[PDB]
């Protein structure tokens, strides 16, 4: 009706949907829009609770990054082992989601020939990585690196991994980010 | 082409930074369902921002171009960009008639809320990028894009241009930057 | 084939060399152009598999700081044989491969000539025909290379995409194989 099977997303709310350190400590806002052979991806992160909400590298000098993993089965269905919760990961309907959990999203999965699964004896190429920067609090001198890797997780058919890292000593800085856009080659 | 809202890609000035028609903002918004793919560049053709000289004007380090939209996604006259230049694509030009509705191109208000007393302002309504004056690799300028942070409108796209180098007799005409944002509908 | 995808012009996502930087088939340029109406969404990476740019050593070659890959197109948007990119696997998509026949027209994928004019002797050259990006050798965050993409600035063709790769660090025995970068450009039609 208003079902939008060309967008797979978290809904644009600020309600937590993600575990970095503890259940529901963060909102990963992730929008995957299918433009044929490419997925246009838009991502940001708000940490609402737990250890990563406020970075203080004076008190926690070793706290310099964390990972959010989306693991997908052979149908492109988000697995329970993901950091991202399944509840509100679905095809778009307006500002919400389709009324039923999707069964197939292979059109949204990172291409396995572009981005092969890890295997001994085959060369691992960097083209399964996209680097970006996002900025804590929108401040131009609070960069964090967002490294996105496709299909490098085990125990799944497809994966998107977000590795967040910083090299600056952030003192009482709320971990809530600007947005970044990237694309990747779709499986079909 | 009602999937593209743009300024035709010619060099004819369409924008007021400092004075009438001092610049060409080339802005292309392509609707890929729930996301708008945006491509932007700027040519300053006249007035105070045409040639940057930070020897003469050491405090001249940025400026803003605002697109303000009403509840129908129609560009408001208070915008820096002229309304007569902003329309759905027709070939290398624009539709001959004013659009009535472009809510599908507006930045999503739940993703990017209007400024409100008492409520948390999140940075996800910002995208940072760099563009390069004259295409020169050592003439970066920051283009900060903010969604729905202007007052007196339903929706907004704001381009804040800034630089942290002393540019001497540098023409303010930029490389292109691509970003996306979540659409209202 | 009703699996022909004339909204994707690409190299295929495989690792088979398709590009000459220094010598025949020394690299795989993975380039995917997806038509979203008036804009082409472009995704690019480079693997150098052989020849002088496979392993950078700026101790042995201190002046070696860049190279160029040119795609030159005729009036129909057909890739010219003189390009760095090889013609045989540059085609509209069919699944993970290409349409069975070489395309005759791809003007919808060409960089817009009003946005990005050809070089002319008397004419003001605007920088908006350039996009800058970074990619990272071996996926390592401290091995950046600049990828500068320029539209329609080559002579002897109707359209062009030029990739200028450069770096500003001393890379010692670093394999030139990159992360991916996404950009867009305004389409001719």
Residue numbers in the entry:
A (entry chain C): 179 to 366
B (entry chain A): 182 to 366
C (entry chain B): 178 to 366
Direct quotes from the study:
To evaluate the potential for these recombinant fiber knob proteins to bind cellular sialic acid residues, crystals of the fiber-knob proteins were also soaked with sialic acid prior to data collection. This resulted in four structures of HAdV-D25, D29, D30 and D53 in complex with sialic acid also shown in Fig. 1. Crystals of HAdV-D53 fiber knob protein were too sensitive to soaking, and only very short soaks could rescue any samples suitable for diffraction. The short soak allowed only two of four trimers in the asymmetric unit to bind β-sialic acid, with a significant change in packing, explaining the sensitivity of these crystals to soaking. The conformation of the bound sialic acid was found to be a mixture of the α and β anomers, freely exchangeable in solution and minimal protein side chain adjustment was required to accommodate either conformation. HAdV-D53 is of particular interest due to the recent confirmation of EKC causing infection, similar to previously identified sialic acid binding viruses HAdV-D37 and D64. In contrast, viruses pseudotyped with the fiber-knob protein of HAdV-D26 demonstrated a statistically significant reduction in transduction in all cell lines following cleavage of sialic acid. This was also demonstrated by viruses pseudotyped with an HAdV-D53 fiber knob protein, where all reductions in transduction were also statistically significant in all three cell lines tested. There was an overall trend in reduction, although in BT-20 cells there was a small, non-significant, increase in transduction of HAdV-D29 fiber-knob protein virus following treatment with neuraminidase. These results indicate significant usage of sialic acid by HAdV-D53 fiber-knob proteins, and the potential partial usage across the other species D adenovirus fiber-knob proteins. One of the viruses in this article that demonstrated significantly reduced transduction on removal of sialic acid following neuraminidase treatment is HAdV-D53.
